[PDB]
Design a protein around this ligand. Sequence first.
Ligand SMILES: [Zn+2]
Ligand SMILES: [Zn+2]
Ligand SMILES: [Zn+2]
Lengths: 67, 47, 1095, 49
Amino acid sequence: MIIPVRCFTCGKIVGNKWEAYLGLLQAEYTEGDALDALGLKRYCCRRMLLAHVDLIEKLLNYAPLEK
Amino acid sequence: QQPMIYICGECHTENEIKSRDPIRCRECGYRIMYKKRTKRLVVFDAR
Amino acid sequence: PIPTVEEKWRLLPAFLKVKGLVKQHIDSFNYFINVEIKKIMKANEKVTSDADPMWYLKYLNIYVGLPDVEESFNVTRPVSPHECRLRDMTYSAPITVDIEYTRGSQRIIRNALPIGRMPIMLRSSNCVLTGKTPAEFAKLNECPLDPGGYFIVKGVEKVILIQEQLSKNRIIVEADRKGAVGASVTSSTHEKKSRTNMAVKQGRFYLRHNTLSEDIPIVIIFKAMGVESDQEIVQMIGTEEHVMAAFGPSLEECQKAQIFTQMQALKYIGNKVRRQKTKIEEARELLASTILTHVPVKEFNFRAKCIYTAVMVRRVILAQGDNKVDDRDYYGNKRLELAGQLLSLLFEDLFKKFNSEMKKIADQVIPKQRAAQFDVVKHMRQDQITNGMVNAISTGNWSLKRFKMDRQGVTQVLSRLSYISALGMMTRISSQFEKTRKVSGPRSLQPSQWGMLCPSDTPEGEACGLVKNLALMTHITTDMEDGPIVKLASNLGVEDVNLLCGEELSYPNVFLVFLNGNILGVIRDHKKLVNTFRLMRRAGYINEFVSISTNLTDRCVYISSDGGRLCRPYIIVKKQKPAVTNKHMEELAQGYRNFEDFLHESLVEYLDVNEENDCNIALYEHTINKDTTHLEIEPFTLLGVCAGLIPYPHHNQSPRNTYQCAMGKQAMGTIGYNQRNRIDTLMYLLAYPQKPMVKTKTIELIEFEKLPAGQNATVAVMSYSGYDIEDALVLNKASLDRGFGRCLVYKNAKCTLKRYTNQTFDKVMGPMLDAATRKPIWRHEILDADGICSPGEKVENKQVLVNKSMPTVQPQYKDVPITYKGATDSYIEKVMISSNAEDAFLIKMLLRQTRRPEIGDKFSSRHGQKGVCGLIVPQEDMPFCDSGICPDIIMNPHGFPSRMTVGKLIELLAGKAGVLDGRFHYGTAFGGSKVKDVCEDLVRHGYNYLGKDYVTSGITGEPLEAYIYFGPVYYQKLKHMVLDKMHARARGPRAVLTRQPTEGRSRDGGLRLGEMERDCLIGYGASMLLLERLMISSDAFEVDVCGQCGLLGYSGWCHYCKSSCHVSSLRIPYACKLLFQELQSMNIIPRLKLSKYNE
Amino acid sequence: LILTRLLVPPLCIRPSVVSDLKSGTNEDDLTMKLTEIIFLNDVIKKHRI
Ligand SMILES: [Zn+2]
Ligand SMILES: [Zn+2]
Ligand SMILES: [Zn+2]
């Protein structure tokens, strides 16, 4: 649903770079280049941002709205 | 006592059902209603 | 080297865009409500009464409108599928017909007469959900990824399974315990199915049929059909010395009996046959259009029937004496049946019943009349049709007395467990064969099926081949005509069967033409015939779904054009080279020259199962030879939908492939885009679904990356302390606390309440307050002031949800408050209150429960490896290798050789390389990536080249001698948790018929102890324990018996002998006394004989 | 060997069921058949007179 706040294996906070990662994928950057410039070093806390789906945005279109 | 407030699923209007009346909405023509959230104090654990 | 085109992989999406996967289920219905609905209309259009020939009915036109609902009064508004799914309504639309009835003296034409309703598909052309946009799909609260194809009847999703059957209008030659036997099954457009069979015994042919009493020689039937001279009979049979020596006994038997004229033959047939109008007339009508209905007769000419029977006799002659038999497992003849033909039969039967019913209600009102005008609109009902359709769809028991057929288990509830199980249910195909252990051929993999049914996709258990699934590239042919086909055939130069005699058909050069089990005629030079037919088919004049093949053993060409055949597109080759070039695919990449234009330009073509029998197909382009006729587009299309989720299927073994195909529909995950709005009985959700690193092209074809049902986790293949047993896998406590594998369960609780025929109604009490404080009672604690529970609260065990009070007969009400039954404490999400179609109040509640993985849960590796949890390993353990990465789930290396799964290691390697590089690697079947270009890319970063890493143990603190296999793997969580598969019973409810624990864990029942375990207790020699847990803790009863006359008394007193002296008591289980008192009604008196055990 | 006197079994061998959906009681089929046999026995006696 949402990006996890901490990693599952080690426990490093990777929930503070999802918006930065999204903003970095539109400035003519490579996936690996952006992931290395974000601050991730190993593949322990790198798969949380690379392979991650965003379904809450699709779930907000069905959310109740006030009129 | 206080009128039981209910919300619709198409226009989301806060209406009330009085007694044994046709269950519908007074603004739209939708025939399904929802309920509000309780105003009590619930305890949750963050562990 | 050969010129290769690596661009034909984009033809498959273009072909799937128009039809394919699930669209054919909707085309079968869209063609049905546009052609067959009119076919049955023109079938029964005029009905007349019998009192006086002045009243008659006529039908102008019939059609179906849009899905509508009839509310309180004179209000028709468009309804939404989600609205019916939430109100437990039924998705149906009315049927508008134009009727014409003549009342009195003038004629009345009342347009737009409603006669009933009819269900509508979810993604049909008449429904609203078609041609919309995702923004508009979100406004109607419906998932845009929903493939559809199911029926909504009373708020449940029902899918009609495709069923395979044998072809009609054909000759089969089988072998039984005596020898060879021929059979012919016929079924025409009208309601008459027949099955005739020719049997051979002691060199004498006999014909058997359902209406015939005894067997009749075939020569008698020949003489009766119209051929008088016996020479022409043998001439039609066969012009050969060995076929004439086998027809001698029949000739001498026909000569023995005094039968030489057609009248005597018909008299013999009339004497033989029994039917419950002289014998000659009934014998003549029995041979005209009764035994063989698929062969029409113009006036009374049995010439075509004689020719067909002669070909059948020649077939059974050539079969006998050889080692050639026809088998039923061949899929070239087996046909498929969708939901269209079943609905066609049902609607035809219902329309005929409705026409015959009103004909009977208006025949006894015209003579005994009191007026001069009779209107048929007032004497009309539209409830029977709707009720019948709804019941036939819901129950699923197709019962048609006009067709004389009964079928059960055709419609099934659409499984909404996951996104793959829902789509895979639409591709499921069941067979007509029952649960038979003896049959093994049909269950076994047949060489006939190639790219039509996925071999790996099959359930594991009892059904080991009876349930099959379709392939990715598959199309079912619809129904068509035969006028232009037979016209072009006659124009090609085919000779009529009425011109040539019987001796010409035995000639080898002579070839016969068969069209849907019908002899078209005789033709020479069949090669040019087939070539010209294929050229005309490629041109565009004749439809593309026409199959034509040749048989040299039988020396005849078969022309198949009936609906329900299997075909997949194939690329045509031109003598050394495929017609498809790079310039033709560049235009497809541009946006023009679609599949339709390719089929119109003679670039690709469809082939049948029997059509591909007479052609050579090449797998790749380097294998293309000078004899190949067609080329495979893609070889990875042979796998199914559930088999496309397995990385490197060719690397894995077929049992593991089948296991993973069976477990793919069991894994829990995201259902769709609207899962919180829909309220189903049981629903499973995941917390944070990850994306598969090594995805497949089939995954992108179905867009499975948007709704994944698993998570990526770091796996280290090595042994651990003591909990790496064959399938036991251990977990990481820190990862489980961080939230790896968090699941949610959602249960539905629905309560309906209505009125009665009298003024008796219902009502809800609500909250109950005490006299001490102004707080609700413990019983009704979650209850609100209105009388229903509030959303966003927590319900524990034995708690009232909604107060329901029902009248017993001012009236006394009995309280039946629904109580929540559960071990853990659930939470309330929302409460919905609505009205049903019968003006009844319906209250639905959704209860959520969040769970965490623990010891006793079942996990899978998406590689056919299921395992239960071991021990929860803390973070102080799980040694890191170099950086500080701890294994999330430890895998056991001892189960790899037994399962023989090499695709798992390659999957781990490719996943590691991808997560290091930063791009997803393709792992499709019969291709993907190798282990040579990936092994050299893992070196640039700095890691080892294949899989090895240096690990230092954390328990002791010393480096490990051997290296460990580390890498990311895609795991999935399945159902059957330890919390639900756990129950116990000591003293609960019992049955009233027999005092024993009840069945089921939801009713607080016990376990059953059968003879399987009783034999083990007997083998040991322990008898006290056997009687303790079959009599003492099962049923113990005291019964008094008299010694003089063994009978059941009461309070130590007999009523037969009238004596209190002779009396004793015993301990007898309630079942034994039950049987003893139940056997007395069968005029049987069990008299016991009491003996002294002490002496 | 000829049925002349019918033996009524105990009532405890044929329990009755009740459904709490429309206040519906259903006896055992044995009891229904016994009470149907009794209705067929007196129509012969009344037809005689
Ligand atoms: Zn990490
Ligand atoms: Zn409203
Ligand atoms: Zn006695």
